[PDB]
Short mmCIF file of N, CA, C and O in Angstrom, two decimals:
data_model
loop_
_atom_site.label_atom_id
_atom_site.label_comp_id
_atom_site.label_asym_id
_atom_site.label_seq_id
_atom_site.Cartn_x
_atom_site.Cartn_y
_atom_site.Cartn_z
N UNK A 1 28.53 -35.60 5.27
CA UNK A 1 29.90 -35.30 5.66
C UNK A 1 30.93 -35.86 4.68
O UNK A 1 32.11 -35.54 4.81
N UNK A 2 30.50 -36.67 3.72
CA UNK A 2 31.37 -37.24 2.69
C UNK A 2 30.82 -36.92 1.31
O UNK A 2 30.72 -37.78 0.43
N UNK A 3 30.44 -35.66 1.11
CA UNK A 3 29.87 -35.23 -0.16
C UNK A 3 30.83 -35.54 -1.30
O UNK A 3 32.03 -35.26 -1.22
N UNK A 4 30.29 -36.12 -2.37
CA UNK A 4 31.08 -36.47 -3.53
C UNK A 4 31.28 -35.25 -4.42
O UNK A 4 30.33 -34.52 -4.70
N UNK A 5 32.52 -35.04 -4.86
CA UNK A 5 32.88 -33.92 -5.71
C UNK A 5 33.22 -34.44 -7.10
O UNK A 5 34.09 -35.31 -7.24
N UNK A 6 32.55 -33.91 -8.12
CA UNK A 6 32.81 -34.26 -9.51
C UNK A 6 33.23 -33.00 -10.26
O UNK A 6 32.54 -31.97 -10.18
N UNK A 7 34.34 -33.09 -10.98
CA UNK A 7 34.85 -31.96 -11.74
C UNK A 7 34.18 -31.93 -13.11
O UNK A 7 34.20 -32.92 -13.84
N UNK A 8 33.58 -30.79 -13.44
CA UNK A 8 32.96 -30.57 -14.74
C UNK A 8 33.76 -29.49 -15.46
O UNK A 8 33.90 -28.37 -14.95
N UNK A 9 34.29 -29.83 -16.63
CA UNK A 9 35.10 -28.90 -17.40
C UNK A 9 35.11 -29.35 -18.85
O UNK A 9 34.78 -30.49 -19.17
N UNK A 10 35.50 -28.42 -19.73
CA UNK A 10 35.64 -28.70 -21.15
C UNK A 10 34.31 -29.19 -21.74
O UNK A 10 34.20 -30.31 -22.25
N UNK A 11 33.31 -28.33 -21.65
CA UNK A 11 31.97 -28.64 -22.16
C UNK A 11 31.15 -27.37 -22.09
O UNK A 11 31.64 -26.30 -21.72
N UNK A 12 29.87 -27.49 -22.44
CA UNK A 12 28.92 -26.38 -22.38
C UNK A 12 27.92 -26.70 -21.28
O UNK A 12 27.17 -27.68 -21.36
N UNK A 13 27.90 -25.86 -20.24
CA UNK A 13 27.02 -26.06 -19.09
C UNK A 13 25.67 -25.38 -19.36
O UNK A 13 25.29 -24.39 -18.74
N UNK A 14 24.94 -25.96 -20.31
CA UNK A 14 23.62 -25.45 -20.64
C UNK A 14 22.70 -25.53 -19.44
O UNK A 14 22.72 -26.50 -18.68
N UNK A 15 21.88 -24.49 -19.26
CA UNK A 15 20.91 -24.44 -18.18
C UNK A 15 19.47 -24.35 -18.64
O UNK A 15 18.57 -24.41 -17.80
N UNK A 16 19.22 -24.21 -19.95
CA UNK A 16 17.85 -24.12 -20.43
C UNK A 16 17.04 -25.34 -20.00
O UNK A 16 15.96 -25.20 -19.41
N UNK A 17 17.56 -26.54 -20.27
CA UNK A 17 16.89 -27.75 -19.82
C UNK A 17 16.89 -27.87 -18.31
O UNK A 17 16.08 -28.60 -17.74
N UNK A 18 17.79 -27.15 -17.63
CA UNK A 18 17.88 -27.24 -16.18
C UNK A 18 16.85 -26.35 -15.50
O UNK A 18 15.99 -26.83 -14.75
N UNK A 19 16.92 -25.04 -15.75
CA UNK A 19 16.01 -24.11 -15.07
C UNK A 19 14.57 -24.37 -15.47
O UNK A 19 13.68 -24.42 -14.62
N UNK A 20 14.31 -24.54 -16.77
CA UNK A 20 12.93 -24.65 -17.24
C UNK A 20 12.22 -25.83 -16.60
O UNK A 20 10.99 -25.82 -16.47
N UNK A 21 12.96 -26.86 -16.19
CA UNK A 21 12.35 -28.01 -15.54
C UNK A 21 11.64 -27.58 -14.26
O UNK A 21 12.20 -26.83 -13.45
N UNK A 22 10.41 -28.04 -14.09
CA UNK A 22 9.60 -27.71 -12.92
C UNK A 22 9.74 -28.73 -11.80
O UNK A 22 9.15 -28.54 -10.74
N UNK A 23 10.51 -29.80 -12.01
CA UNK A 23 10.67 -30.83 -10.99
C UNK A 23 11.44 -30.33 -9.77
O UNK A 23 11.47 -31.03 -8.75
N UNK A 24 12.07 -29.16 -9.86
CA UNK A 24 12.86 -28.63 -8.76
C UNK A 24 12.01 -27.74 -7.86
O UNK A 24 11.06 -27.10 -8.31
N UNK A 25 12.38 -27.71 -6.58
CA UNK A 25 11.67 -26.94 -5.58
C UNK A 25 12.38 -25.63 -5.23
O UNK A 25 11.75 -24.57 -5.21
N UNK A 26 13.68 -25.69 -4.97
CA UNK A 26 14.46 -24.51 -4.60
C UNK A 26 15.72 -24.46 -5.44
O UNK A 26 16.40 -25.48 -5.61
N UNK A 27 16.03 -23.28 -5.97
CA UNK A 27 17.26 -23.07 -6.73
C UNK A 27 17.55 -21.58 -6.74
O UNK A 27 16.81 -20.81 -7.34
N UNK A 28 18.63 -21.18 -6.06
CA UNK A 28 19.01 -19.78 -5.96
C UNK A 28 20.50 -19.63 -6.25
O UNK A 28 21.32 -20.41 -5.75
N UNK A 29 20.84 -18.63 -7.05
CA UNK A 29 22.22 -18.28 -7.36
C UNK A 29 22.56 -16.99 -6.63
O UNK A 29 22.01 -15.93 -6.95
N UNK A 30 23.46 -17.08 -5.65
CA UNK A 30 23.79 -15.94 -4.81
C UNK A 30 24.92 -15.09 -5.37
O UNK A 30 25.22 -14.04 -4.80
N UNK A 31 25.54 -15.50 -6.47
CA UNK A 31 26.62 -14.74 -7.06
C UNK A 31 26.42 -14.43 -8.53
O UNK A 31 27.06 -13.53 -9.07
N UNK A 32 25.53 -15.17 -9.18
CA UNK A 32 25.25 -15.02 -10.60
C UNK A 32 23.74 -15.10 -10.81
O UNK A 32 22.98 -15.30 -9.86
N UNK A 33 23.32 -14.95 -12.06
CA UNK A 33 21.92 -15.03 -12.43
C UNK A 33 21.76 -15.95 -13.63
O UNK A 33 22.64 -16.01 -14.49
N UNK A 34 20.64 -16.68 -13.71
CA UNK A 34 20.42 -17.53 -14.89
C UNK A 34 20.40 -16.74 -16.19
O UNK A 34 20.81 -17.26 -17.23
N UNK A 35 19.92 -15.50 -16.16
CA UNK A 35 19.85 -14.70 -17.38
C UNK A 35 21.23 -14.49 -17.98
O UNK A 35 21.41 -14.61 -19.20
N UNK A 36 22.22 -14.17 -17.14
CA UNK A 36 23.58 -13.94 -17.60
C UNK A 36 24.45 -15.19 -17.54
O UNK A 36 25.62 -15.13 -17.91
N UNK A 37 23.90 -16.32 -17.08
CA UNK A 37 24.70 -17.54 -17.00
C UNK A 37 25.21 -17.97 -18.37
O UNK A 37 26.38 -18.35 -18.51
N UNK A 38 24.35 -17.91 -19.39
CA UNK A 38 24.75 -18.36 -20.71
C UNK A 38 25.89 -17.52 -21.27
O UNK A 38 26.80 -18.05 -21.92
N UNK A 39 25.85 -16.21 -21.03
CA UNK A 39 26.85 -15.29 -21.56
C UNK A 39 28.08 -15.18 -20.66
O UNK A 39 28.80 -14.18 -20.74
N UNK A 40 28.32 -16.17 -19.81
CA UNK A 40 29.48 -16.18 -18.93
C UNK A 40 30.26 -17.47 -19.14
O UNK A 40 29.67 -18.55 -19.25
N UNK A 41 31.58 -17.35 -19.18
CA UNK A 41 32.48 -18.47 -19.41
C UNK A 41 33.18 -18.83 -18.11
O UNK A 41 33.74 -17.96 -17.44
N UNK A 42 33.15 -20.11 -17.76
CA UNK A 42 33.73 -20.61 -16.52
C UNK A 42 34.97 -21.45 -16.83
O UNK A 42 35.00 -22.19 -17.82
N UNK A 43 35.99 -21.32 -15.98
CA UNK A 43 37.20 -22.12 -16.16
C UNK A 43 36.95 -23.57 -15.79
O UNK A 43 37.41 -24.48 -16.49
N UNK A 44 36.24 -23.81 -14.69
CA UNK A 44 35.95 -25.17 -14.25
C UNK A 44 34.78 -25.12 -13.27
O UNK A 44 34.67 -24.18 -12.49
N UNK A 45 33.93 -26.14 -13.33
CA UNK A 45 32.76 -26.25 -12.47
C UNK A 45 32.82 -27.59 -11.75
O UNK A 45 33.01 -28.63 -12.39
N UNK A 46 32.64 -27.56 -10.43
CA UNK A 46 32.60 -28.76 -9.61
C UNK A 46 31.21 -28.92 -9.03
O UNK A 46 30.59 -27.94 -8.59
N UNK A 47 30.71 -30.16 -9.02
CA UNK A 47 29.39 -30.48 -8.50
C UNK A 47 29.54 -31.30 -7.23
O UNK A 47 30.18 -32.36 -7.25
N UNK A 48 28.95 -30.82 -6.14
CA UNK A 48 28.94 -31.52 -4.86
C UNK A 48 27.51 -31.96 -4.58
O UNK A 48 26.66 -31.14 -4.24
N UNK A 49 27.26 -33.26 -4.71
CA UNK A 49 25.93 -33.83 -4.54
C UNK A 49 25.86 -34.60 -3.23
O UNK A 49 26.74 -35.41 -2.94
N UNK B 1 13.70 -2.26 11.72
CA UNK B 1 12.92 -1.36 10.87
C UNK B 1 13.02 -1.86 9.44
O UNK B 1 14.06 -1.73 8.79
N UNK B 2 11.94 -2.46 8.94
CA UNK B 2 11.89 -3.01 7.59
C UNK B 2 11.03 -2.17 6.66
O UNK B 2 10.71 -2.62 5.55
N UNK B 3 10.64 -0.97 7.08
CA UNK B 3 9.78 -0.13 6.25
C UNK B 3 10.48 0.38 5.00
O UNK B 3 9.81 0.83 4.07
N UNK B 4 11.81 0.32 4.96
CA UNK B 4 12.56 0.77 3.80
C UNK B 4 12.60 -0.35 2.77
O UNK B 4 13.07 -1.46 3.06
N UNK B 5 12.11 -0.07 1.56
CA UNK B 5 12.01 -1.06 0.50
C UNK B 5 12.93 -0.68 -0.65
O UNK B 5 13.14 0.50 -0.94
N UNK B 6 13.48 -1.70 -1.31
CA UNK B 6 14.32 -1.50 -2.48
C UNK B 6 13.93 -2.51 -3.55
O UNK B 6 13.58 -3.65 -3.25
N UNK B 7 14.01 -2.08 -4.80
CA UNK B 7 13.72 -2.96 -5.92
C UNK B 7 14.87 -3.94 -6.13
O UNK B 7 16.04 -3.60 -5.92
N UNK B 8 14.52 -5.16 -6.53
CA UNK B 8 15.51 -6.21 -6.75
C UNK B 8 15.54 -6.75 -8.17
O UNK B 8 16.57 -7.30 -8.57
N UNK B 9 14.46 -6.62 -8.93
CA UNK B 9 14.42 -7.09 -10.31
C UNK B 9 13.83 -6.01 -11.20
O UNK B 9 13.04 -5.18 -10.76
N UNK B 10 14.23 -6.04 -12.47
CA UNK B 10 13.70 -5.11 -13.45
C UNK B 10 13.95 -5.67 -14.84
O UNK B 10 14.91 -6.41 -15.06
N UNK B 11 13.06 -5.32 -15.77
CA UNK B 11 13.18 -5.83 -17.13
C UNK B 11 14.48 -5.38 -17.77
O UNK B 11 15.16 -6.17 -18.44
N UNK B 12 14.86 -4.12 -17.56
CA UNK B 12 16.10 -3.60 -18.12
C UNK B 12 16.59 -2.46 -17.24
O UNK B 12 15.85 -1.93 -16.41
N UNK B 13 17.85 -2.09 -17.44
CA UNK B 13 18.44 -1.01 -16.66
C UNK B 13 17.65 0.28 -16.85
O UNK B 13 17.32 0.66 -17.97
N UNK B 14 17.34 0.95 -15.74
CA UNK B 14 16.60 2.20 -15.79
C UNK B 14 17.53 3.34 -16.17
O UNK B 14 18.69 3.39 -15.77
N UNK B 15 17.00 4.28 -16.96
CA UNK B 15 17.77 5.42 -17.39
C UNK B 15 18.01 6.37 -16.22
O UNK B 15 17.32 6.30 -15.20
N UNK B 16 19.00 7.26 -16.33
CA UNK B 16 19.33 8.14 -15.21
C UNK B 16 18.14 8.99 -14.79
O UNK B 16 17.32 9.40 -15.61
N UNK B 17 18.04 9.24 -13.48
CA UNK B 17 16.99 10.07 -12.91
C UNK B 17 15.61 9.58 -13.34
O UNK B 17 14.77 10.34 -13.83
N UNK B 18 15.38 8.28 -13.15
CA UNK B 18 14.10 7.66 -13.42
C UNK B 18 13.60 7.00 -12.14
O UNK B 18 14.36 6.29 -11.47
N UNK B 19 12.34 7.23 -11.81
CA UNK B 19 11.71 6.62 -10.64
C UNK B 19 10.78 5.51 -11.10
O UNK B 19 9.92 5.73 -11.97
N UNK B 20 10.93 4.33 -10.52
CA UNK B 20 10.09 3.18 -10.82
C UNK B 20 9.38 2.76 -9.54
O UNK B 20 10.03 2.53 -8.51
N UNK B 21 8.05 2.68 -9.60
CA UNK B 21 7.23 2.32 -8.45
C UNK B 21 6.31 1.15 -8.75
O UNK B 21 5.39 0.87 -7.98
N UNK B 22 6.54 0.44 -9.86
CA UNK B 22 5.71 -0.71 -10.19
C UNK B 22 5.84 -1.78 -9.12
O UNK B 22 6.92 -1.99 -8.55
N UNK B 23 4.74 -2.47 -8.85
CA UNK B 23 4.70 -3.56 -7.87
C UNK B 23 4.41 -4.91 -8.51
O UNK B 23 4.22 -5.89 -7.79
N UNK B 24 4.37 -4.98 -9.84
CA UNK B 24 4.09 -6.24 -10.51
C UNK B 24 5.16 -7.27 -10.17
O UNK B 24 6.35 -6.95 -10.08
N UNK B 25 4.73 -8.51 -9.98
CA UNK B 25 5.66 -9.57 -9.63
C UNK B 25 6.59 -9.84 -10.81
O UNK B 25 6.22 -9.65 -11.98
N UNK B 26 7.80 -10.29 -10.50
CA UNK B 26 8.83 -10.51 -11.51
C UNK B 26 8.93 -12.00 -11.84
O UNK B 26 8.76 -12.85 -10.97
N UNK B 27 9.21 -12.29 -13.11
CA UNK B 27 9.40 -13.65 -13.59
C UNK B 27 10.84 -13.79 -14.05
O UNK B 27 11.31 -13.02 -14.89
N UNK B 28 11.54 -14.78 -13.50
CA UNK B 28 12.95 -15.01 -13.79
C UNK B 28 13.17 -16.11 -14.82
O UNK B 28 14.31 -16.52 -15.04
N UNK B 29 12.10 -16.59 -15.47
CA UNK B 29 12.21 -17.66 -16.43
C UNK B 29 11.31 -17.42 -17.63
O UNK B 29 10.59 -16.42 -17.69
N UNK B 30 11.37 -18.35 -18.58
CA UNK B 30 10.58 -18.24 -19.79
C UNK B 30 9.11 -18.54 -19.56
O UNK B 30 8.26 -18.12 -20.36
N UNK B 31 8.78 -19.26 -18.49
CA UNK B 31 7.38 -19.58 -18.22
C UNK B 31 6.61 -18.30 -17.88
O UNK B 31 7.14 -17.41 -17.21
N UNK B 32 5.36 -18.18 -18.32
CA UNK B 32 4.57 -17.00 -17.97
C UNK B 32 4.25 -16.97 -16.48
O UNK B 32 4.17 -18.00 -15.82
N UNK B 33 4.06 -15.76 -15.97
CA UNK B 33 3.72 -15.53 -14.57
C UNK B 33 2.39 -14.78 -14.54
O UNK B 33 2.35 -13.55 -14.48
N UNK B 34 1.29 -15.53 -14.59
CA UNK B 34 -0.04 -14.95 -14.56
C UNK B 34 -0.47 -14.68 -13.13
O UNK B 34 0.09 -15.22 -12.17
N UNK B 35 -1.48 -13.83 -12.99
CA UNK B 35 -1.99 -13.52 -11.67
C UNK B 35 -0.94 -12.80 -10.82
O UNK B 35 -0.05 -12.12 -11.33
N UNK B 36 -1.06 -12.97 -9.50
CA UNK B 36 -0.15 -12.35 -8.55
C UNK B 36 0.98 -13.28 -8.15
O UNK B 36 1.84 -12.89 -7.35
N UNK B 37 1.01 -14.51 -8.66
CA UNK B 37 2.06 -15.46 -8.32
C UNK B 37 2.20 -16.47 -9.44
O UNK B 37 1.34 -16.59 -10.31
N UNK B 38 3.32 -17.19 -9.41
CA UNK B 38 3.57 -18.22 -10.40
C UNK B 38 4.88 -18.92 -10.08
O UNK B 38 5.52 -18.66 -9.06
N UNK B 39 5.26 -19.82 -10.98
CA UNK B 39 6.49 -20.58 -10.79
C UNK B 39 7.69 -19.65 -10.80
O UNK B 39 7.91 -18.91 -11.77
N UNK B 40 8.46 -19.68 -9.71
CA UNK B 40 9.65 -18.85 -9.58
C UNK B 40 9.33 -17.38 -9.85
O UNK B 40 10.07 -16.68 -10.55
N UNK B 41 8.21 -16.92 -9.30
CA UNK B 41 7.80 -15.53 -9.39
C UNK B 41 8.15 -14.84 -8.08
O UNK B 41 7.74 -15.29 -7.01
N UNK B 42 8.90 -13.75 -8.17
CA UNK B 42 9.43 -13.06 -7.00
C UNK B 42 8.97 -11.61 -6.98
O UNK B 42 8.93 -10.95 -8.02
N UNK B 43 8.61 -11.14 -5.80
CA UNK B 43 8.20 -9.75 -5.65
C UNK B 43 9.41 -8.84 -5.80
O UNK B 43 10.42 -9.04 -5.11
N UNK B 44 9.36 -7.84 -6.68
CA UNK B 44 10.57 -7.03 -6.93
C UNK B 44 11.06 -6.27 -5.71
O UNK B 44 12.24 -5.89 -5.68
N UNK B 45 10.22 -6.02 -4.72
CA UNK B 45 10.56 -5.17 -3.59
C UNK B 45 10.94 -6.03 -2.38
O UNK B 45 10.16 -6.89 -1.96
N UNK B 46 12.12 -5.77 -1.83
CA UNK B 46 12.61 -6.45 -0.64
C UNK B 46 12.92 -5.41 0.43
O UNK B 46 13.51 -4.36 0.13
N UNK B 47 12.52 -5.70 1.66
CA UNK B 47 12.74 -4.76 2.75
C UNK B 47 14.22 -4.74 3.13
O UNK B 47 15.05 -5.45 2.57
N UNK B 48 14.54 -3.89 4.11
CA UNK B 48 15.90 -3.74 4.61
C UNK B 48 15.95 -4.19 6.07
O UNK B 48 15.14 -3.75 6.89
N UNK B 49 16.91 -5.05 6.38
CA UNK B 49 17.09 -5.52 7.74
C UNK B 49 17.92 -4.58 8.57
O UNK B 49 19.03 -4.92 8.99
#
């Protein structure tokens, strides 16, 4: 109920090291795809952990 | 009635008036997908709710 929000901006949000990692169990993108993630530019990304 | 099936993944966009009936499992990552299953291997066909 007190999820921490961190603003991620002004950088490259590489996912190669992210997706390729097998340590993860579930990861689904309901609005985008990893294939087109690299070729897409985001204004700002926030992480809620 | 879930008997209606639709494709969800494909290697590339299909040309006009092309029918695809392949049932091979899809791989969304660089890792190989051997056999009938693998890491993040998804069946291209999803039923309709």
